[PDB]
């Protein structure tokens, strides 16, 4: 082990200083340099590709699933929480939309 | 119409110079500030989350999903073609591993 381990979930304050949500493979993240996330903002949105963040998460705000970005290691900052599974599954839909995917 | 419209599939020479493949939905490529795309590269790798590219394509090299970055459309430069829909289904497969999908 020559570097940090972040997780799918895991919730990092980053200056590329705003949240940001590791949403990239468990073993990409162990084993490489860098993740990817999607960004927590305190903007309101009402649209697919927004998930609010639920009375059981460690954080408020919402998650901007159109907001995908690739994150060094390095950058990544104060350690903030895991969103739960429930609010996970919504996240996986609106990354999917994001991404024009023909899933679910 | 008010600024440019790309669209999924389509690949454009961007310095943040190399190319990038769109991968964000076409309605929020028309109407919003910004798109999200992949890395093109040269660089050859035999894994689920690299795309080579196919003899219908209009480009050579391979398409690096792992490397999931927010372009501004003032960063998009020359248009250098659209990839084959073969080729982006696979490109939606590795986006999905890349970002840990339940899908397919």
Redesign the interface.
């Known amino acids: 082990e020559f570097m940090n381990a972040p997780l ?1 979930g895991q919730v990092y304050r980053c200056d590329l200083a705003k949240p940001w949500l590791i ?4 073993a ?1 993240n162990r084993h ?1 340099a860098d993740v ?1 996330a999607v960004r927590l903002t305190t903007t309101r949105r009402t649209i697919p ?1 927004w998930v609010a963040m639920g009375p059981s998460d460690p954080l408020t705000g919402y998650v901007n699933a ?5 994150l060094g290691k390095d950058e990544l900052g104060d350690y903030l929480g895991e969103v739960t599974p429930a609010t996970m599954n919504k996240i ?1 839909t609106a ?10």
């Open positions: 799918r949403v990239s493979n468990n990409r490489t990817v590709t159109d907001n995908i970005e690739t996986n990354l999917a939309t994001a991404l024009g995917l023909p899933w679910p």
